[PDB]
A paper describes a structure:
Crocagins (1 and 2)24 are very small, intriguing RiPPs that possess a tetracyclic ring system, which consists of a pyrroloindoline fused to a tetrahydropyrimidinone moiety. Here we use in vitro experiments to demonstrate that three proteins, [name], CgnC and CgnE, are sufficient for the production of the hallmark tetracyclic crocagin core from the precursor peptide CgnA. We further show that the hydrolase CgnD liberates the crocagin core scaffold, which is subsequently N-methylated by CgnL. The crystal structures of the homologues [name] and CgnE reveal them to be the founding members of a peptide-binding protein family and allow us to rationalize their distinct functions.
[name] was recalcitrant to crystallization until a slight molar excess of CgnA was added prior to crystallization trials. We determined the [name] structure to 2.3 Å resolution but observed no electron density for CgnA, so the peptide may simply have acted as an additive to promote crystallization. Curiously, [name] contained a dinuclear metal centre that was partially occupied. The binding sites comprised [name] residues Glu161, Glu252 (shared between Zn2+ 1 and 2), Glu274 and His280 (Zn2+ 1) and His291 and Asp293 (Zn2+ 2). As expected for homologous proteins, the Cα root-mean-square deviation (r.m.s.d.) between the structures of [name] and CgnE was only 1.2 Å over 284 residues. The aminopeptidases form an extensive dimer interface, and the residues involved in its formation are largely missing in [name] and CgnE, which rationalizes their monomeric state in the crystals. The leader peptide is enriched with positively charged amino acids, and both [name] and CgnE show a large, strongly negatively charged patch near the possible binding site. Hydroxylation at the Tyr20 Cβ position allows [name] to catalyse an elimination reaction via its bound Zn2+ (or Co2+) ions, which results in a double bond between the Tyr20 Cα and Cβ atoms, creating a conjugated amine. The CgnE homologue [name] on the other hand appears to possess catalytic activity.
Numbering used by the authors: 0 to 303
The structure:
Amino acid sequence: SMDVLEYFERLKNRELAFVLDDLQLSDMVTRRGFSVIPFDDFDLAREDHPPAFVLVTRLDYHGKLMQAWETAKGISSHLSLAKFDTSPKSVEYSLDQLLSMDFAETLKRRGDYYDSVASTNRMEVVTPGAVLTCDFGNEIEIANNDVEMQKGWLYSVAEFFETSVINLEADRSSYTLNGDLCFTGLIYLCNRPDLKERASATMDELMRMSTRGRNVVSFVDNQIVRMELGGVDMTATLRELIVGKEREGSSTEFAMGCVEYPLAQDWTINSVMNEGSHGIHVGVGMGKEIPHMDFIAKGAELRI
Ligand SMILES: [Zn+2]
Ligand SMILES: [Zn+2]
């Protein structure tokens, strides 16, 4: 059972089997010094298989990987970009971001942030013109927090870049949000091709707006009640895409990014890498009938 830092040092040193699902992306990966093997040729089931990094670009392959979880018997994480933007531009950006960052530095902030959620009942997020409060319940649901990677467990890399609390069982099974959050940009995640066809165009509009000025999201009783992007109120567009669907405005994720990205971020690119941006991000939607939006505030400071 390999240690997480042991895993990523090998990733930095190109000592991992790079499993790839779209071979048209092979040249960009091999140009970065990795030996690539197609997805359908790597035996995740064999226990002696070498420690692997899987890049899933396609939703059908994202499903094939999920089919192999209970059968997996070795060491593997995977960067799942199938549910975000899967263009070469997004893929090159995601890999450049991952391969440039300081992993050990990221994992300790992550460890420290979990040392903060467990102890405290209240968190205050201060952004330039806003303050957000988070009241953790007595029973919080969290994303996998293993620091030594277990055998047969398919780790999503992203969960190594953030400390994430989520309201999965019910609307407020873990935490409640009241107040405002001024954020930098956003990403959005869709689990189905049906949803991605409907919302992607709109969500990309919202992302580009986020570059044009003040971004602010407001919560009352853990329900999103206002969404300002580029200094303009878009709450009407928010309601059209959440009303009458799933839990509507219920916040679904409260998480803390732990990555000091050395390379410039691009907030027009819907890549999961941006969710790990050092700071705070809030989640709305489950990616089923509403895209799971993540309003990400970078330089945000925390208060207990
Ligand atoms: Zn998150
Ligand atoms: Zn999220």
